[PDB]
Design a protein around this motif. Structure first.
Motif, PDB file in Angstrom:
ATOM      1  N   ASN A   1       0.909  -1.171   0.000  1.00 20.86           N
ATOM      2  CA  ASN A   1       0.000   0.000   0.000  1.00 20.86           C
ATOM      3  C   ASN A   1       0.936   1.204   0.000  1.00 20.86           C
ATOM      4  O   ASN A   1       1.371   1.671   1.052  1.00 20.86           O
ATOM      5  CB  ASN A   1      -0.971  -0.009   1.204  1.00 20.86           C
ATOM      6  CG  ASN A   1      -2.096   1.033   1.085  1.00 20.86           C
ATOM      7  OD1 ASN A   1      -2.541   1.409  -0.028  1.00 20.86           O
ATOM      8  ND2 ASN A   1      -2.576   1.511   2.247  1.00 20.86           N
ATOM      9  N   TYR A   2       1.276   1.680  -1.196  1.00 23.33           N
ATOM     10  CA  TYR A   2       2.236   2.786  -1.306  1.00 23.33           C
ATOM     11  C   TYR A   2       1.627   4.157  -0.980  1.00 23.33           C
ATOM     12  O   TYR A   2       0.533   4.479  -1.425  1.00 23.33           O
ATOM     13  CB  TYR A   2       2.771   2.813  -2.707  1.00 23.33           C
ATOM     14  CG  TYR A   2       3.813   1.734  -2.980  1.00 23.33           C
ATOM     15  CD1 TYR A   2       5.185   2.037  -2.918  1.00 23.33           C
ATOM     16  CD2 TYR A   2       3.422   0.435  -3.289  1.00 23.33           C
ATOM     17  CE1 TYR A   2       6.144   1.044  -3.219  1.00 23.33           C
ATOM     18  CE2 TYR A   2       4.327  -0.549  -3.557  1.00 23.33           C
ATOM     19  CZ  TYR A   2       5.708  -0.231  -3.529  1.00 23.33           C
ATOM     20  OH  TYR A   2       6.578  -1.253  -3.812  1.00 23.33           O
ATOM     21  N   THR A   3       2.411   4.997  -0.280  1.00 19.91           N
ATOM     22  CA  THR A   3       2.070   6.404  -0.115  1.00 19.91           C
ATOM     23  C   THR A   3       2.509   7.221  -1.350  1.00 19.91           C
ATOM     24  O   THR A   3       3.617   7.024  -1.858  1.00 19.91           O
ATOM     25  CB  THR A   3       2.787   6.960   1.126  1.00 19.91           C
ATOM     26  OG1 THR A   3       2.386   6.172   2.248  1.00 19.91           O
ATOM     27  CG2 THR A   3       2.357   8.417   1.382  1.00 19.91           C
TER      28      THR A   3
ATOM     29  N   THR B   1      -6.918   8.230  -5.947  1.00 17.94           N
ATOM     30  CA  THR B   1      -7.001   9.359  -5.037  1.00 17.94           C
ATOM     31  C   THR B   1      -7.132  10.654  -5.869  1.00 17.94           C
ATOM     32  O   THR B   1      -6.708  10.701  -7.032  1.00 17.94           O
ATOM     33  CB  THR B   1      -5.742   9.481  -4.093  1.00 17.94           C
ATOM     34  OG1 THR B   1      -4.595   9.867  -4.880  1.00 17.94           O
ATOM     35  CG2 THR B   1      -5.391   8.177  -3.366  1.00 17.94           C
TER      36      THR B   1
ATOM     37  N   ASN C   1       0.974  15.520  -0.196  1.00 10.64           N
ATOM     38  CA  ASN C   1       0.581  14.154   0.141  1.00 10.64           C
ATOM     39  C   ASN C   1      -0.600  13.717  -0.774  1.00 10.64           C
ATOM     40  O   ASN C   1      -1.641  14.371  -0.800  1.00 10.64           O
ATOM     41  CB  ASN C   1       0.126  14.139   1.594  1.00 10.64           C
ATOM     42  CG  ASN C   1      -0.129  12.741   2.128  1.00 10.64           C
ATOM     43  OD1 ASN C   1      -0.537  11.838   1.417  1.00 10.64           O
ATOM     44  ND2 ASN C   1       0.144  12.563   3.413  1.00 10.64           N
TER      45      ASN C   1
ATOM     46  N   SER D   1      -2.768   7.057  -0.538  1.00 16.24           N
ATOM     47  CA  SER D   1      -2.116   5.744  -0.729  1.00 16.24           C
ATOM     48  C   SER D   1      -2.817   4.974  -1.809  1.00 16.24           C
ATOM     49  O   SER D   1      -3.990   5.204  -2.052  1.00 16.24           O
ATOM     50  CB  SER D   1      -2.171   4.876   0.539  1.00 16.24           C
ATOM     51  OG  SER D   1      -1.500   5.480   1.598  1.00 16.24           O
TER      52      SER D   1
ATOM     53  N   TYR E   1      -2.832   0.727  -3.397  1.00 16.03           N
ATOM     54  CA  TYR E   1      -2.295  -0.611  -3.345  1.00 16.03           C
ATOM     55  C   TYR E   1      -1.793  -1.024  -4.728  1.00 16.03           C
ATOM     56  O   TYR E   1      -2.562  -1.014  -5.735  1.00 16.03           O
ATOM     57  CB  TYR E   1      -3.319  -1.668  -2.823  1.00 16.03           C
ATOM     58  CG  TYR E   1      -2.669  -3.024  -2.799  1.00 16.03           C
ATOM     59  CD1 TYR E   1      -1.796  -3.382  -1.735  1.00 16.03           C
ATOM     60  CD2 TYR E   1      -2.862  -3.928  -3.842  1.00 16.03           C
ATOM     61  CE1 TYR E   1      -1.111  -4.626  -1.759  1.00 16.03           C
ATOM     62  CE2 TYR E   1      -2.198  -5.155  -3.871  1.00 16.03           C
ATOM     63  CZ  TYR E   1      -1.352  -5.496  -2.826  1.00 16.03           C
ATOM     64  OH  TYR E   1      -0.737  -6.708  -2.889  1.00 16.03           O
TER      65      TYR E   1
ATOM     66  N   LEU F   1       6.422   7.057  -4.990  1.00 19.28           N
ATOM     67  CA  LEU F   1       5.576   6.039  -4.354  1.00 19.28           C
ATOM     68  C   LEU F   1       6.465   5.411  -3.284  1.00 19.28           C
ATOM     69  O   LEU F   1       7.557   4.968  -3.606  1.00 19.28           O
ATOM     70  CB  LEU F   1       5.152   5.006  -5.404  1.00 19.28           C
ATOM     71  CG  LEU F   1       4.267   5.605  -6.547  1.00 19.28           C
ATOM     72  CD1 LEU F   1       4.191   4.656  -7.767  1.00 19.28           C
ATOM     73  CD2 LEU F   1       2.905   5.932  -6.001  1.00 19.28           C
TER      74      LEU F   1
ATOM     75  N   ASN G   1       6.754   2.683   0.131  1.00 18.88           N
ATOM     76  CA  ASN G   1       6.190   1.668   1.010  1.00 18.88           C
ATOM     77  C   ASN G   1       7.028   1.571   2.317  1.00 18.88           C
ATOM     78  O   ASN G   1       6.680   0.797   3.235  1.00 18.88           O
ATOM     79  CB  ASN G   1       6.120   0.334   0.268  1.00 18.88           C
ATOM     80  CG  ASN G   1       5.090  -0.623   0.888  1.00 18.88           C
ATOM     81  OD1 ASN G   1       4.009  -0.193   1.280  1.00 18.88           O
ATOM     82  ND2 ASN G   1       5.438  -1.916   0.986  1.00 18.88           N
TER      83      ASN G   1
END
Ligand SMILES: OC[C@H]1O[C@@H](O)[C@H](O)[C@H](O[C@@H]2O[C@H]3CO[C@@H]([C@@H]2O)[C@@H]3O[C@@H]2O[C@H](CO)[C@H](O)[C@H](O[C@@H]3O[C@H]4CO[C@@H]([C@@H]3O)[C@@H]4O[C@@H]3O[C@H](CO)[C@H](O)[C@H](O[C@@H]4O[C@H]5CO[C@@H]([C@@H]4O)[C@@H]5O)[C@H]3O)[C@H]2O)[C@H]1O
Ligand SMILES: [Ca+2]
Ligand SMILES: [Ca+2]
Ligand SMILES: [Cl-]
Ligand SMILES: [Cl-]
Ligand SMILES: [Cl-]
Length: 138
Positions: free
Chosen positions: A58-60, A88, A104, A107, A109, A136, A138
């Motif tokens: 689940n990358y930010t 997002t 920001n 996140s 996936y 990205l 993690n």
């Protein structure tokens, strides 16, 4: 499970959009202060990337983005089965077109594999944002 991928916005594989901005391509590239970036991003414009992801997670999402208007938003999408899935949507603060700030992006996936990512000018304004890169993590 730690992993990090910085993708340069200028390294898109395709761009598109209907807005008539008089340029050769619907999204353009420029450099400022040694930061190469995409600009002339309008409402409905988009930039497509192919990303190889070794590590599922689940990358930010972090953007180095700027805008000189209110009403720009970056919609992050992933192609899933020949269908874009919105992940997002992130408004871009209005702090100057050349003034890139970490932003920001929420996140997403991402499975281990190869993904098609789209960044889309999703806000209300004719003009959206400029983008140096996105990361990205993690
Ligand atoms: O007697 C009274 C009248 O006197 C007469 O002499 C006049 O005719 C006048 O008539 C009016 O004149 C003006 C005032 O009201 C209207 C009426 O006709 C008219 O309004 C102007 O009309 C213009 C079109 O004909 C324009 O729409 C103008 O709007 C502006 O146009 C450009 C300049 O500034 C922006 C604005 O919308 C627009 O520029 C774009 O702005 C974006 C931000 O909104 C952005 O910066 C764009 O550029 C990009 O920025 C960054 C992202 O990508 C790149 C890119 O360069 C970069 O990194 C920019 O192009 C409108 O006011 C009576 O007074
Ligand atoms: Ca454009
Ligand atoms: Ca860049
Ligand atoms: Cl890259
Ligand atoms: Cl800098
Ligand atoms: Cl997700």
């Amino acid at each position: 499970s730690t992993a990090s991928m910085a993708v340069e916005a200028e390294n898109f594989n395709a761009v598109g959009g209907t807005f008539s901005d008089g340029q050769a391509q619907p999204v353009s590239v420029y450099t400022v202060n040694g930061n190469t970036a995409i600009n002339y991003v309008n409402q409905g414009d988009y930039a497509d990337y192919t990303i190889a992801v070794a590590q599922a997670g689940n990358y930010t999402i972090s953007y180095q983005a700027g805008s000189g208007v209110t009403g720009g938003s970056i919609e992050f999408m992933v192609n899933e089965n020949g269908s874009w899935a919105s992940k997002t949507v992130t408004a871009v603060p209005n702090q100057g077109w050349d003034n890139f700030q970490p932003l920001n992006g929420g996140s997403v996936y991402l499975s281990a594999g190869t993904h098609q990512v789209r960044l889309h000018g999703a806000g209300s304004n004719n003009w959206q944002w400029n983008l140096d890169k996105f990361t990205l993590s993690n």
